[PDB]
Amino acid sequence: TFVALYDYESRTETDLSFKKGERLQIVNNTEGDWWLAHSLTTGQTGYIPSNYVAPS
């Protein structure tokens, strides 16, 4: 249960764009600042910038 401090605009299929307050299911956050998150709204995978999300 993470919260995207802001809306992240992805630029490739290896990442998903989120909005501010959007909840994302973090997956792997030990690889790089870009953790893999999965949206539960539609069900799609997409890395995410950690500087744009925070642990509630």
Partner: peptide, 12 residues
């Protein structure tokens, strides 16, 4: 374990 290493974007 490869697309997680990227240059974080500019925060708002």
């Amino acid at each position: 374990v490869s697309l997680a290493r990227r240059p974080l974007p500019p925060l708002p």
